[PDB]
Amino acid sequence: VVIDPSGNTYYNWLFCITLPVMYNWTMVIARACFDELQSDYLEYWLILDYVSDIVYLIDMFVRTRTGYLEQGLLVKEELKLINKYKSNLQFKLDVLSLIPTDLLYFKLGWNYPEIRLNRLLRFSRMFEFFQRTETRTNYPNIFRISNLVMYIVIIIHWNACVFYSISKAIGFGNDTWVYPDINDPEFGRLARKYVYSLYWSTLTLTTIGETPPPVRDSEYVFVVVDFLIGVLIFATIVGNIGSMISNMNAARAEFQARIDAIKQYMHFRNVSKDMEKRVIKWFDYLWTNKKTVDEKEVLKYLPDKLRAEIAINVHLDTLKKVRIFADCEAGLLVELVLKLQPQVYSPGDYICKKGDIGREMYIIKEGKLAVVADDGVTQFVVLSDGSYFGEISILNIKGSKAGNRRTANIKSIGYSDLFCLSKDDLMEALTEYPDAKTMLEEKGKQILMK
Template sequence: VDPAGEWYRRWLTVMIIPVLYNWIILICRLHRSCFSDLQRNYLALWLTLDYLCDLLYLLDMAVRLSTGFLEQGILITDRKQICKRYLRTSQFVHDILSLFPTDLLYLKVGIHTPVVRVNRFIRTPRLFEAFDRLETRTPYPNVFRVCKLMLYIFVFTHWNTCVYFALSEYIGFGADGWVYPNMSDPAFSTLTRQYLYSFYFSTLILTTVGDTPEPHREEEYLFMMMDFLVAVLVFATVVGSIGSIISNLNKADAAFFPNYERVKSYLKVHRVNRDLQRRVNNWYQHLQINQKMTNENEILKTLPDRLRAEVAVSVHLQTLMKVQIFQNCEMSLLEELVLKLRPQVFSPGSYICKKGDIGREMYIIKEGKLAVVADDGVTEFAVLGEGNYFGEISILNIKEIGNKSGNRRTANIKSIGYSDLFCLSKEDLKEVLSEFPGAKTILEEKGKAILLKMKMLDEAAALEVGNQEAGLEAKVQRIEKSLGSLYTSLARLVGELQSSTLKLRYRIKLLEEETRVWPISDPDSEREERGRQ
């Protein structure tokens, strides 16, 4: 069994049932302490469910004996190794204790004493493991956390209910206004009323809403004080959990959608006109209502590069392959380009580009409609829909190879409604093509073919530019050769300089040694000595 697989998750989901059954039902059936009528009236049902849960516990041990484990990142599937590892863990000890045949004590204490099965609670960690696994798989983790918290509160209140009823039985039903009323009253004699009244009373205490009868005996005071102290802890836990869930929701919104509050404050501080503020408000409202994401790269940045590329490829590769110049390109280049795509949303009437603008991006239409309009902004020449693209020539910088338009936009394009586009900038393409020099040449050739077809390429200029580039390339090669020769000569000179320096240092050292052996005399003192002689 793969511990990360779907089958294992489903089995953990099944194991929630027996664990919760023991936690909820066992406390209700305790003889002479809780709802003992529940034990006596439905004995056959409880015995059947008890041993069915024991069977699931036993099957769970078999599943553990067949569940692989990771060693140095590799899934170990050898059954002998799995069994050996499981038998050495504390999980095996807990599983054995939870299935220890304490039911044999029924022969001594009687069949109506289910307290002998209290060891079944030891299997509780399996419940927590199942919840953790489900929380990571569910598409609504915050809703799941709320439901899990409510379940914990219910189980705790349920136990408190049973303790209250047992305490009432110990003190005496109807002995005062705090305990459960006397069962001689038909309204309070049924099992359903006993449980609901006790549960309601426990809820009042644990929620500290008041309206609880005043206690009269020491046991009642102790019970109330303990419940109040626990209620404070439960209340703090609930508030903290709900606050954490709300915080997670806010963080999720901040991760998926841009923060509008700062933009709103900016517009107010600078007193931007109301019409522009309204357009900005509508744009943000559209993003929020329709769940539009404009920062995908920021969301996926925590993933490893390879995994992030695979996610981006699965989402956007088909869109990128619709662009003519990128068709038949190698997959590694497309994967790098997919990571550079930036989603953008344009509101109705917004211009994506205007005639004469310098082309720095290309756009791919994911959703919506764009209109190619005249300078008056009203006359429509064409409508572009989902899957269309434009601006692919501009990001290749075709001006250098004879583009008659001078790498400027040749049309006005504006959004008819709300439009979702993917943008690829010239800088991002240049960065990617620096690692794929062969692909750069292929893309430029495709760009030339498109411009020739559109009659937007000056062939003479392109040829002249090509000759200039060839001449420049030859000059660069000659310069590189000259630099190589200069580097060689420089290295030789440096070597000779180092050798001369070493020789000079050696000679200076010898002279210093001779000076220390034969001290230098003063010429004036020598002449005076000769005169005296």
């Protein structure tokens, strides 16, 4: 065997089949419409055509060898793959694209390469490669812009070829609208022919005009049709690129929209300038360290298994430093990693207050936190990263005062990026391992007796 379509090997072949398909979509019509392009480089075009046909045979062999999913499992039986490929429309499209029409070279002559206007029917491989690349690549917006620009270039090139063909059918130099006479030394060059056709197609499709007016009825009709194509088909792709470039920074746009909403609220409510400055400073801190993205609303579309694996992988350094789990067997961390809720606190913020009925336990991942006195000046113990706290009020223990209240108050010396484990969710996980329960209770009694 199978090719494993979800694997990297199948994707690597998708690029190797996209090149002949793009060449057939690009240069077959160019050779068909520009006679000098086909005639001058006939050996090169024959070599490229043979290479593309060979890659087409290899692609058909791969599609016979590729494995689909039945009952959720990959199919390794060869005959089943043959039946699945042949029953699909893709086999018919590949066969129709690979009908050998080169024999018509012996009938219609070497100057008719439009007989290969079936080999671009295998656009499905190119579209599949574009769909797979868009998921795989690290720059999806850049790739989407490049793909749509490639579509624009293909459309303009095809319109240039069509305009040159219409000039050829009507006759070069017969009218002011058509391409000038081939006998002209300046306009007889193949490069000049192609680039003036491209210039005319660019003017017509990009709604510029600035072309000689049509003289014949067919010329007027084709100009109307091509301007309608430029207004409808071309300009829609143009607007899509405009929206995609405008929406490259979607997360930044959402963050800025939040900033505008909060600033408009503060301006309407006549909030003091100091508070507005503090809000601006907080949001600058959020944006500078890339804390503006929320993985609760981003990873919620992922499955719970894969989301839990990502949460384990991202925070692998900070949970191993926590002494309440990942110690006896390094297996408890899997259950409570999904229940971690990340919170960010400003400096000078009292995360825990004395006497409050805390409904959660806070696990420090980033930032330095201080155990504060009653006045707010004297700090006893400075808590570094990986140090758990707030575990007294979550569970009641016998022989303790203020079981549902915090024994001490905790403030953040600087910015702290710490998780908060809820009271109810920890009870479900802690009942599995009694040793962790009694260790937590012993530590709580040790810190509560004084």
